[PDB]
Design a binder for this molecule. Sequence first.
Ligand SMILES: NCc1cccc(-c2cccc(C(=O)Nc3ccccc3CC(=O)O)c2)c1
Ligand code: NA
Length: 236
Amino acid sequence: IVGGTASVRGEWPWQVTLHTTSPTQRHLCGGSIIGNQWILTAAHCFYGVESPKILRVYSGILNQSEIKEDTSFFGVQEIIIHDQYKMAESGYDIALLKLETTVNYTDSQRPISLPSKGDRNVIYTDCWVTGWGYRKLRDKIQNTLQKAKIPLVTNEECQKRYRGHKITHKMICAGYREGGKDACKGDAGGPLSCKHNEVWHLVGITSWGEGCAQRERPGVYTNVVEYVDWILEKTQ
Ligand SMILES: NCc1cccc(-c2cccc(C(=O)Nc3ccccc3CC(=O)O)c2)c1
Ligand code: NA
């Protein structure tokens, strides 16, 4: 996250850190708890991943330094990538992880609701992007989970900033005109969480953009509401 601030314990209890374990153990991407054995994340995170055997999902983490050799984690039973996915920039950047066991919900780990059926006309004005990603293009994974409030921009405006790409209604965009706050490497797969009537909803999945926090180049996110039929079908 560029231009963010440190989160505190329990602040974003749906946020998980997905680690790979080979050839070293490291944070790969973010994800969101959406059900008792289900993480929603970005398909592009799994480039070159041979199988789910080399993944671990850690919930209830604030600082990456908390993770020790005896820290509990969930194995991944299945990786479900959208059948139309090809590359992040070309859309369908969405995947589900089915965990090997269930997540017991507490103040530090619980699910986030999807955008509600019937809420098409809701205008989200309180949206936050979170993660352990880089603070700029040439950086490293951050220790403490970062947060930044980012305004949505219309798809019409977003398309004008990305004339070499097809911005579709399966995407949404968020960023400031003068940049300064955005997601960056290591944040993909995590949530764009928006609060409406004091309930948080998973509006976007961090996906891609041109650089990080550059002026007039908003972050591009998977538009979760356009995938509810797909998510519900896979998780039923
Ligand atoms: N501001 C837009 C924005 C939003 C999110 C990520 C980036 C960004 C920047 C530079 C490099 C990368 C990258 O190599 N990613 C990658 C590739 C394969 C697997 C996992 C990942 C991590 C990931 O995507 O987080 C991503 C940019
Ligand atoms: Na769908």
